[PDB]
Amino acid sequence: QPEPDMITIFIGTWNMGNAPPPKKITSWFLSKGQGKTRDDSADYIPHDIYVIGTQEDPLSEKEWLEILKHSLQEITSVTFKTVAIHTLWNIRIVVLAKPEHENRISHICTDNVKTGIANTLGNKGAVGVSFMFNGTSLGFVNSHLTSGSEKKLRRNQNYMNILRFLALGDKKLSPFNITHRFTHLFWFGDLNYRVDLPTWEAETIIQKIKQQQYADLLSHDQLLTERREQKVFLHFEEEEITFAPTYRFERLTRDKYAYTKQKATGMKYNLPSWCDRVLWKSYPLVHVVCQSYGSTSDIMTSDHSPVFATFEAGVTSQFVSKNGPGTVDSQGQIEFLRCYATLKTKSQTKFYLEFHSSCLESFVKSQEGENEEGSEGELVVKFGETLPKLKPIISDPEYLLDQHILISIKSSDSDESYGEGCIALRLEATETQLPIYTPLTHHGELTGHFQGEIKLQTSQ
Numbered sequence: 001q002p003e004p005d006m007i008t009i010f011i012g013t014w015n016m017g018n019a020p021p022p023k024k025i026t027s028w029f030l031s032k033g034q035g036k037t038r039d040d041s042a043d044y045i046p047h048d049i050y051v052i053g054t055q056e057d058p059l060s061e062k063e064w065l066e067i068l069k070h071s072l073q074e075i076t077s078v079t080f081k082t083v084a085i086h087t088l089w090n091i092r093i094v095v096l097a098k099p100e101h102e103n104r105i106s107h108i109c110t111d112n113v114k115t116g117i118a119n120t121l122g123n124k125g126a127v128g129v130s131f132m133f134n135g136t137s138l139g140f141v142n143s144h145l146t147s148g149s150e151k152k153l154r155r156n157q158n159y160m161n162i163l164r165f166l167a168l169g170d171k172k173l174s175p176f177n178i179t180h181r182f183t184h185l186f187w188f189g190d191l192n193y194r195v196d197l198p199t200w201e202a203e204t205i206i207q208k209i210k211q212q213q214y215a216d217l218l219s220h221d222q223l224l225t226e227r228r229e230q231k232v233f234l235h236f237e238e239e240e241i242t243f244a245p246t247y248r249f250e251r252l253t254r255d256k257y258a259y260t261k262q263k264a265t266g267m268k269y270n271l272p273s274w275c276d277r278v279l280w281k282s283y284p285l286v287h288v289v290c291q292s293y294g295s296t297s298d299i300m301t302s303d304h305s306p307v308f309a310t311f312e313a314g315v316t317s318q319f320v321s322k323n324g325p326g327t328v329d330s331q332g333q334i335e336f337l338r339c340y341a342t343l344k345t346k347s348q349t350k351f352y353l354e355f356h357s358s359c360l361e362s363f364v365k366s367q368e369g370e371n372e373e374g375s376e377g378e379l380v381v382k383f384g385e386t387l388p389k390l391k392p393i394i395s396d397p398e399y400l401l402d403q404h405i406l407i408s409i410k411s412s413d414s415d416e417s418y419g420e421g422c423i424a425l426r427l428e429a430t431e432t433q434l435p436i437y438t439p440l441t442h443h444g445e446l447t448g449h450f451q452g453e454i455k456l457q458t459s460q
């Protein structure tokens, strides 16, 4: 029974509005309703992994797991296995997988982050799950960010705190945050970004929605505008939105947006918004294709509609050779030529690189680079031909071309990372000098770039 090279992953996010779900929620898991929906012909075909994020979830873990498993069994006739469940207050993540994957899934981690301070600490934050699926690392974040149209900068701060403090994946990857630890990272939730249009335009927005004319609304979506200005979710993807705003509905129908200020809203307007979102970030040149992104029409217990997204995701096998794991394969090597880092820092410390990859027995430290003053005031750290030759554990090109090298540029003075990036080994050629490039980020913000050339030697 061969190992898969692709799986499908269902991501769901639903702010349940502290109400129990209705008796049938199968439309969510089938990707049916509005937007990019799943073909009817696929309805019986189970996804490999279902990741359910809820916010304002009033249920116990046991109660929700029973509903989820019985929903999936009804759809697929498969009894899904529980990989992980983690709850912070009323923010929950459930990961379910087909039973055939039980011996493919390992290194399961869970964590949460509480955002805010005093007044603003106690109900917002994020839960996350990570695990290995054979050779592939997968991370999942469900966040409930700060509410309110006039709090986009707080949401961006919440994002920055979650990606800095959520402790998932391989703890040896000490320079790297969750945005570099996984082959595929999915980040979803009630992100709470709003359509930034005047209050007076509420009924205009509603009439645009009823015409299915979303363009003038999406052009004011705070998440899209903050992402375009590189304020949040740098280097993440989101499928095009083709479904109506998922908030704020009158409960028990979907015919009515409830936007007006009420004592119950703290006298705030809740103009129709795409609060409920799914984004992803995958290592360079790994297959990931969004196959659905939409909202249900028939689940009306909450003032939010559920959102679904499904993905094809490339996965690799747990590779064994005669040599690695547990030794190197002399027939393999990774060389870096004419490499330099460009950093936004004012600092004048010397810098060194660390190279981290599961194709190495352990991470590799470089010698210090040569600082030059770049023309336009930047710091250029030149490594030229000084970088260590990396010795992968397996030389087979079917393995090595699927791997990735994480790079951290660290201060010699403090050993603190000034920038992290990732280089794919999925090269156009072996034994050939080829350009490489990654942006560098630190705690999610752009700090520079790393570029040069690479020369990969495989057994072939």
Ligand SMILES: OCc1cn(-c2ccc(Cl)cc2)nn1
Pocket: 081, 082, 083, 097, 098, 099, 101, 102, 103, 104, 105, 106, 108
């Ligand atoms: O003790 C290790 C461990 C493995 N798993 C697990 C559960 C469900 C699936 Cl589908 C796969 C793996 N849970 N704990």
Ligand SMILES: [Mn+2]
Pocket: 164, 177, 443
């Ligand atoms: Mn950090």
